[PDB]
Design a protein around this ligand. Structure first.
Ligand code: CDL
Ligand code: CDL
Ligand code: CDL
Ligand code: PEE
Ligand code: PEE
Ligand code: PEE
Ligand code: LPP
Ligand code: LPP
Ligand code: ZN
Lengths: 141, 75, 147, 107, 226, 230, 62, 141, 62
């Protein structure tokens, strides 16, 4: 049985409605921008259009598309080095999804997977990526 | 997957409710042929009034085949 | 469909941890959006790219429990587990489970009226109808007389 | 044009043969200039004025409902004399319609 | 509501510099004794501590989960009050239209004071009459002299106070088990390690419990120039 | 729950401004009038500050109220110009056969119409940036250059005109209509000198007001050009 | 809106009443004179007291 | 559009009378209960019955009109909207081009012709013996 | 004049009709915040001004 809850929005001018406790928990969880991350999936049509604005991103996006990776843009800038981990991460997430989905109702045990390759997780909280917004060419050449 | 560039999508329709906005039957969306006929007549009157400056002062002499009571004697 | 599609409030991200858009006057840093799209990739193109929320796999058992307890919520939770939930899918889930606040008339204290007074309600209504009948007839009578 | 509320004959049928039209006086009473006590100070004379408002008066009917002092315009609804701040809570103009929604009811 | 202006940035979240620096006392303060800012950060710290602990969520009941996030389980008393509050707010900049009032179901006129000016326009169509204004004072069942429409005043009053979302939450919500600071530390180490902070609120909160300036980079975070 | 309006209970600028106005009348020196004008500017600016500080009330109807006031004001500006056009055309039957030199239809009208059009384009770019939450520094200085040239050209024209106000009602109407336009041009300088980027963006009545006013003044010059030069 | 001008506030109690040293209630200026003359007539007028009520307004010679 | 209109061009608050068309009717629909079937007599009025937030559709409209103010990306409008937004700006720019490349050339030609022949090329040469350029707008003579 | 919002209002086609008037009546209105309320207020105005027989006499005079 799921109880109803009051959900309020606004700081000084507050609007109260009734809502689902689980839906509110998901809403706050997705607000943890550092933990839950949006990831991009590409198609060949859109990868080609990217080249019209950033040639380097087109090449890196093509690699992600060829491997069918849902990848964060920040990671995409380092796909050359992160590719082996990303492929391993893809497998582990798929294993976990399958295990949880196939489990019988009422079975809420944690999935068995290698969390060390999945980011962001306690086992691997990620890397300190250096900014790549640095010119490396001499205008006089 | 397949997508559509938002810049070339069609305009969204007005919502269908008790209070519905409809401009289809007004005919005020764009200038019609009648407006362009007004422009053509204006150009014509402008040119005519200058080309033929004796039109407002016509000749009262009239022959009129089939007399004056025939339809082609009124134009 | 409001403000030309520009959100009143939106998230911006910066690659350099010590970057300040107000103190610095450099010309190389490119801001990103909430999904991480660099600013040099136009909106028309980035909005076509499909972005889905990825929660850590340790949350899958919790998202599964939510679906089972509320079967109407299961399809949305399944999308989230499978990494198929976009922002639009989240919005649909959010507004689908919002319910209006309920007011109960049985909880309102009533103005004080004695039991004797409560038994005269039909009589007072009866007087009111006769007053409306007499009013309406008099209107015709007076209109005829004065005009 | 307005000609009063419509009446159905069924609504004009009494429940007793002795029913007549209630003879309740709608004259509020005898009044004059509000008379302040000398002893009362400015604060207590303000309370006195607030307790002499005709628009706060009503007539109670035989069934316990009261017909209030009513006016065509809201000018007669503020305290007399008019206070500095009158309509703090927005006056509510009640409109009536036949529309209804299911959420308001319970079976 | 249509009468409200645009959401502020604060309407979504508060800056971490508004977090009370005495976190240890904040997590021990009763709800009735917490101010608006203190209550915001009590709920956010405790709510995010439970949400950022995935392994414990499936075994946590909705009653306990709602308490941790600071959400009030609804009941008929609180629903009635909240509903009448939102109805009052809506009527601030919206028209007042509804069914014809009768003795069984009087027109409900919400008010904070003991009086509110009301106008009767009669019924629908030909039964509509000119506006008849009257002062609706509490404790009387009003009857329009023209159409016999019954009115009644509803007061949003509770124990020398009017009805507010804060009042409803204080009166009906009950504080649960006292928040344990060990949970804050445990979750802090989970998402914050080796210069990576994936729970910024818990890094600041743990720093304050430690005394302010203890965790790496926090002295530099607290050093401002103006 | 709060009140729908945060009532303003007291104000003292009104007394000062009304006294400042009286000084214009009750004075024995024209220098006093010059300094009095500065006092007026100062206190009108204080009233504008009160308007900006009213933003703290977060009242949705405030933008609408001010916007419609501007509409009424623009209407009054249009109707004042109409009265001058009326004065001009009433004596039309006494024009064009008097021994005076009316203005050419080639030089002044063209350079002025070209100039004022560029002013509109700048304001339009400012509006476009306002829509896009962006700013371009050079824009305001282009306005200053345009105003400088306009002032330079109008001054020379008046000084080199060989007919005076007392020569004919035609000349009086020409000078007066041109001056009335110039005054409205100068009022545009008064408004535009404060243009800056404000982060509350499209809830700022200043931006819409400037766009409307500049368009009014340019459109008014089209009417003047047809009446007098062409 | 939290912390905005309240829609309703209760009046604070009036200031303490003042008595004279002998206990006589202190009286304050009152512009309601009792004119001195021999006339004692009382005129009453039915007056509009809204839409459905009236009031019997009396004018007294004094 | 430039001018603010509460009903259509409401950019000050962003209020919209109806929800987005993208939302399923089961998720959100316009507030319209005019077609509600007659209430059974045995049903009893619990709520106020007053038009307001007790109705689900109105509540969701208020909620969405506040929670729509924060969005991850822009809702790109179509080119028709973009053209309308700056219709006056573009038209004025083309007017400037016309004044430079159309009005400019023939006005110059007329003055040069006037220099040699005393009157503009679109005027009737006089024989009265009066001197000067004379009228310029010949159709207003 | 219908009293139920379910019953539609007849409109001719053109530049001065019931549909043309509905589109523009609420452009500057802060009170027409939703379909139900907007239609109620629209029909209220139409009933009051366009279904008033004597109002048409002034239309002739203008
Ligand atoms: C407010 C000033 C008004 C001046 C009006 C003058 C009218 C006459 C013609 C002037 C032609 C130049 C352009 C004027 C239009 C405005 C330009 C503009 O928007 O600039 C923005 C530009 C950057 O603006 P921003 O806000 O930072 O960026 C806006 C955009 O986002 C980014 O902008 P962008 O990068 O897209 O640029 C837009 C582009 C658009 O403009 C064009 O492309 C127009 C091209 C026109 C060609 C005409 C032929 O403009 C430019 O590229 C402008 C380049 C200016 C470089 C100035 C460098 C310093 C010069 C110092 C000279 C010192 C001389 C000393 C002599 C001493 C002798 C003893 O502003 C400046 O750089 C400031 C200067 C603006 C131009 C001033 C022109 C003065 C001309 C003086 C001539 C004196 C001759 C003396 C001869 C003596 C002989 C003996
Ligand atoms: C160390 C130095 C420190 C200087 C500190 C600032 C001093 C300001 C005072 C000053 O110089 O006054 C004399 C200065 C120059 O006048 P002035 O012609 O040498 O002496 C007046 C003559 O007695 C009589 O000449 P007027 O009858 O031709 O009158 C000229 C006009 C003097 O003022 C003006 O002419 C106004 C100047 C701005 C003109 C803007 C015209 C804009 C276009 C309007 C329409 C076309 C106008 C065509 C002319 O008189 C009053 O406005 O103007 C003033 O009296 C005040 C100027 C400042 C305001
Ligand atoms: C002789 C000298 C004449 C001088 C003319 C000066 C014009 C200055 C303003 C020019 C300007 O910026 O206009 C563009 C701009 C275009 O507006 P937009 O929203 O971008 O238009 C979008 C589309 O055009 C499509 O727009 P839409 O058709 O969807 O409708 C939106 C727009 C449509 O309107 C406009 O756009 C107006 C355009 C005017 C152009 C004039 C040339 O609505 C408004 O802007 C309404 C403004 C308020 C009008 C208030 C009228 C008050 C007087 C009513 C009569 C009272 C007395 C009755 C007596 C008889 C009783 C029986 O106009 C305005 O925003 C200005 C509105 C206020 C003008 C007030 C003028 C005095 C009255
Ligand atoms: C096989 C097909 C080939 C077709 C070829 C078509 C060729 C058409 C050529 C058109 C040339 C038009 C030239 C106009 C020159 C005007 C110069 C001029 O007047 O300059 C000054 C004047 C301002 O003078 P003020 O002293 O201020 O006096 C007036 C105001 N008081 O300046 C202006 O008007 C500025 C604008 C100049 C516009 C010049 C236009 C040139 C157009 C060339 C078109 C070429 C088309 C070629 C088509 C090829 C197809 C195969
Ligand atoms: C395509 C654009 C067309 C614009 C048309 C605008 C029409 C506006 C008309 C408004 C006023 C109409 C009044 C009726 C016409 C009468 C015209 C007339 O008789 O003009 C001359 C007569 C004066 O002559 P007398 O007094 O007999 O002797 C003078 C001796 N020195 O009347 C006038 O003075 C006309 C004054 C009105 C002209 C200006 C009207 C308003 C202009 C608005 C501009 C925007
Ligand atoms: C002239 C008086 C006009 C009064 C009606 C219009 C007032 C108006 O819109 O002013 C405000 C508007 C913008 O303020 P916001 O904070 O966006 O809006 C106020 C709160 N919403 O202010 C301005 O227009 C700026 C004025 C700056 C120049 C003032 C120059 C005064 C010159 C006086 C000469 C004598
Ligand atoms: C205050 C002053 C204002 C300015 C001056 C006002 C002048 C009067 C009002 C004019 C307003 C016009 C606005 C534009 C409307 C428009 O274009 O309106 C356009 C409409 C057509 O509408 P569509 O665009 O829908 O087709 O034009 C017509 O209805 C006419 C069609 C063409 C007819 C051609 C033949 C005409 C013959 C006329 C003979 C006249 C003989 C007279 C003998 C005495
Ligand atoms: C506010 C309410 C207003 C209601 C409407 C009032 C309209 C009043 C019109 C009255 C016209 C009477 C004079 C007619 C001309 C005349 O006798 O005029 C007499 C002259 C000369 O006649 P004779 O030479 O034969 O003696 O007629 C003509 O030369 C031709 C006249 C043509 C008229 C056409 C234009 C008017 C059309 C009117 C239609 C509507 C009429 C409504 C009547 C109630
Ligand atoms: Zn009534």
């Amino acid at each position: 049985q799921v109880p109803d809850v009051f959900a309020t929005f606004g700081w000084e001018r507050r609007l109260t409605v009734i809502h689902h406790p689980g839906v509110m928990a998901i809403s706050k969880l997705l607000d943890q921008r550092t933990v839950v991350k949006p990831r991009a999936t590409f198609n060949q049509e859109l990868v080609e259009e990217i080249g019209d604005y950033d040639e380097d991103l087109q090449r890196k996006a093509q690699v992600a598309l060829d491997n069918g990776l849902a990848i964060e843009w920040r990671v995409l800038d380092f796909i050359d080095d992160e590719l082996p981990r990303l492929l391993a991460e893809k497998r582990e997430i798929e294993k976990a999804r399958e295990q949880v989905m196939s489990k019988a109702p009422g079975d809420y045990t944690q999935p068995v997977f290698d969390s060390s390759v999945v980011v962001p997780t306690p086992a691997n909280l990620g890397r300190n990526y250096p900014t790549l917004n640095l010119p490396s060419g001499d205008p006089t050449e | 997957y397949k997508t559509e560039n938002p810049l070339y999508k069609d305009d969204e329709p007005f919502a269908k409710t008790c209070h519905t906005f409809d401009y289809t039957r007004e005919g005020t969306e764009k200038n019609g042929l009648g407006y362009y006929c007004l422009m053509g007549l204006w150009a014509s009157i402008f040119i005519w009034d200058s080309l033929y400056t004796g039109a407002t002062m016509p000749t009262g002499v009239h022959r009129y085949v089939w007399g004056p009571y025939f339809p082609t004697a009124w134009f | 469909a409001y403000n030309g599609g520009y959100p009143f409030h939106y998230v911006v991200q910066y690659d350099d941890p010590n970057y300040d858009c107000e103190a610095d006057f450099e010309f190389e840093e490119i801001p990103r959006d909430e999904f991480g799209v660099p600013a040099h990739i136009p909106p028309e193109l980035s909005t076509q790219i499909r972005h889905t929320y990825y929660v850590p796999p340790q949350y899958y058992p919790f998202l599964k429990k939510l679906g089972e307890d509320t079967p109407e919520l299961k399809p949305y939770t399944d999308k989230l587990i499978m990494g198929d939930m976009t922002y639009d899918d989240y919005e649909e889930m959010f507004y689908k489970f919002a319910k209006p606040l309920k007011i109960y008339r049985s909880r309102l204290p009533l103005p004080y009226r004695t039991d004797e007074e409560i038994s005269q309600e039909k009589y007072v209504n009866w007087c009111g109808r006769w007053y409306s009948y007499r009013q309406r007839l008099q209107g015709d009578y007076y209109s005829r007389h004065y005009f | 044009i307005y000609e009063g509320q419509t009446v159905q004959e069924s609504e004009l049928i009494p429940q007793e043969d002795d029913w007549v039209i209630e003879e309740t006086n709608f004259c509020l009473g005898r009044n004059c200039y509000v008379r302040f006590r000398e002893e009362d100070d400015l604060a207590r004379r303000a309370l006195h004025q607030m307790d002499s408002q005709l628009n706060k008066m009503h007539t109670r009917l035989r069934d316990g409902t009261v017909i209030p002092y009513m006016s065509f315009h809201p000018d007669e609804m503020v305290d007399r004399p008019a206070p500095i701040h009158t309509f703090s809570e927005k006056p509510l103009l009640k409109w009536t319609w036949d529309e209804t929604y299911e959420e308001a009811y319970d079976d | 509501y249509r009468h409200w202006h645009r959401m502020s940035e604060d309407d979504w979240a508060l800056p971490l510099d508004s977090m009370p620096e005495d976190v240890k006392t904040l997590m021990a303060t009763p709800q009735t004794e917490r101010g608006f800012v203190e209550d915001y950060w009590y709920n956010r710290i405790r709510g995010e501590a439970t949400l950022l602990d995935p392994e414990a969520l499936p075994s946590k009941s909705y009653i306990a989960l709602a308490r941790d996030m600071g959400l009030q389980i609804v009941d008929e008393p609180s629903s009635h009050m909240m509903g009448l509050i939102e109805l009052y707010e809506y009527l601030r900049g919206a028209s007042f239209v509804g069914p014809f009032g009768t003795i069984e179901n009087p027109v409900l006129v919400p008010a904070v004071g003991q009086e509110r000016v009301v106008a009767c326009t009669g019924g629908v169509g030909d039964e509509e009459h000119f506006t008849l204004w009257f002062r609706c004072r509490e404790g009387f069942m009003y009857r329009c002299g023209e159409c016999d429409q019954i009115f009644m005043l509803v007061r949003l009053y509770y124990e020398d106070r009017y009805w507010t979302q804060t009042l409803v939450r204080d009166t009906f919500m009950s504080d649960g088990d006292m928040f344990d600071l060990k949970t804050l530390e445990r979750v802090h180490k989970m998402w914050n390690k080796d210069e990576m902070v994936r729970w910024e609120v818990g890094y600041w909160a743990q720093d304050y419990v430690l005394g302010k300036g203890v965790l790496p980079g926090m002295v530099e975070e607290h050093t401002r120039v103006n | 729950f709060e009140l729908n309006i945060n009532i303003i209970n007291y104000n003292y600028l009104g007394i000062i401004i009304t006294v400042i106005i009286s000084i214009y009348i009750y004075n024995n020196s024209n220098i006093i009038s010059v300094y009095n004008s500065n006092l007026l500017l100062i206190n009108i600016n204080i009233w504008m500050k009160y308007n900006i500080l009213d933003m703290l009330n977060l009242n949705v109807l405030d933008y609408k109220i001010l916007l419609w006031i501007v509409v009424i004001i623009i209407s009054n500006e249009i109707l004042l110009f109409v009265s001058f056009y009326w004065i001009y055309y009433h004596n039309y039957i006494n024009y064009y056969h008097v021994n005076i030199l009316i203005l050419n239809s080639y030089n002044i009208v063209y350079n002025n119409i070209i100039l004022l059009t560029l002013l509109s384009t700048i304001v339009n770019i400012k509006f476009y940036n306002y829509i896009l939450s962006y700013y371009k520094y050079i824009l305001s200085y282009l306005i200053y250059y345009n105003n400088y040239m306009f002032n330079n050209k109008i001054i020379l024209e008046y000084k080199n005109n060989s007919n005076y106000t007392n020569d004919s009602v035609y000349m009086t109407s020409y000078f007066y209509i041109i001056l009335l336009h110039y005054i409205h041009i100068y009022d545009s300088i008064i408004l535009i000198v404060v243009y800056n980027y404000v982060n509350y963006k499209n809830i700022n009545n200043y931006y819409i007001n400037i766009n409307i006013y500049y368009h009014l003044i340019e459109v008014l010059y089209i009417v003047i050009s047809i009446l007098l030069y062409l | 809106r939290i912390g905005g001008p309240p829609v309703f506030m209760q009046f604070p109690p009036p200031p303490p009443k003042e008595y004279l040293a002998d206990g006589t209630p202190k009286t304050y200026p009152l512009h309601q004179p009792v004119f001195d003359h021999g006339y004692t007539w009382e005129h009453w007028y039915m007056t509009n007291a809204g839409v459905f009520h009236t009031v019997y307004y009396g004018e007294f010679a004094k | 559009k430039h001018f603010f209109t509460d009903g259509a061009n409401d950019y000050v608050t962003g209020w919209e009378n109806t929800p987005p068309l993208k939302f399923p009717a089961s998720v959100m629909k316009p507030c319209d209960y005019s077609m509600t079937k007659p209430i059974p007599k045995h049903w009893k009025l619990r709520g106020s019955g007053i038009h307001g937030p007790e109705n689900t559709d109105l509540m969701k409209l208020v909620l969405w009109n506040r929670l729509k103010q924060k969005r991850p990306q822009r809702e790109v409008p179509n080119i028709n909207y973009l053209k309308d937004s700056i219709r006056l700006e573009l038209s004025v720019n083309w007017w400037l081009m016309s004044c430079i490349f159309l009005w400019g050339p023939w006005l110059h030609w007329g003055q040069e012709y006037q220099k040699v022949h005393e009157q503009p090329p679109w005027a009737m040469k006089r024989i009265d013996g009066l001197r000067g350029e004379g009228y310029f707008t010949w159709f207003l003579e | 004049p219908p009293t139920r919002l379910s019953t539609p209002l007849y409109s001719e086609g053109g530049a001065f009709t019931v549909n043309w008037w509905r589109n523009r009546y609420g452009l500057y209105s802060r009170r027409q915040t939703d379909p139900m309320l907007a239609e109620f207020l629209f029909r209220q105005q139409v009933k009051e001004w366009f279904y008033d027989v004597p109002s048409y006499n002034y239309a002739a005079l203008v």
